[model samples]
Target: GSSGSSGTGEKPFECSECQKAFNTKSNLIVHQRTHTGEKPSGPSSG
Candidate 1:
């Protein structure tokens, strides 16, 4: 089996809404939530 290329240390993807940068596409997807005010939290109690 072959592994993917080892990316450079530099961050390639930058979020337009913020100055945050990510190395991988999947990481970028998670970073976009910041702009939408989306956060992962524990279950709320009523």
Candidate 2:
């Protein structure tokens, strides 16, 4: 109960490729993959 895990905080991770921000680094990394098309196997496919 001591952990101050605040859910109210905004997404701080930014994509260098598009300058778009995401909620989590994992999400942002996935999103950024959309731009690449083949390296990360983006959401459009699987």
Candidate 3:
């Protein structure tokens, strides 16, 4: 269940994509694109 112990007031993951940090792995993955400007290319070049 969701009753497990969560973050203990400590930051665990440092996102490589942005300056934003997260206390959980899930949060870090979500913010991984803000720092890295690598975006999906569009079909316009094709």
Global lDDT scores for all candidate models: 0.71, 0.74, 0.61
Q: Which tens-of-lDDT digit does each residue in 1-46 have in candidate 3?
A: 6675475454678766345568788877766754444455433556
TM-score of 3: 0.39
> What are the candidates' C-alpha RMSDs?
9.4, 9.0, 9.9
Candidate 3 accuracy as lDDT: 0.61
For residue 7, model 1's alpha carbon misses the true position, in angstroms, by 19
**What lDDT does candidate 1 reach at residue 29?**
80
TM-score of each: 0.45, 0.48, 0.39
Question: Which segments of candidate 1 are over 4 A away from where they belong?
Answer: 1-10, 37-46
Off by over 4 Å in 3: 1-10, 36-46
Error of 2 at 6 (Å): 25
Cα TM-score of candidate 1: 0.45
lDDT of 1 by residue, 1-46 (tens): 8887588465778877666778888889887875664444433565
Count of steric clashes across candidates, in order:
0, 0, 1
Worst 10 residues of 3 by lDDT: 34-43
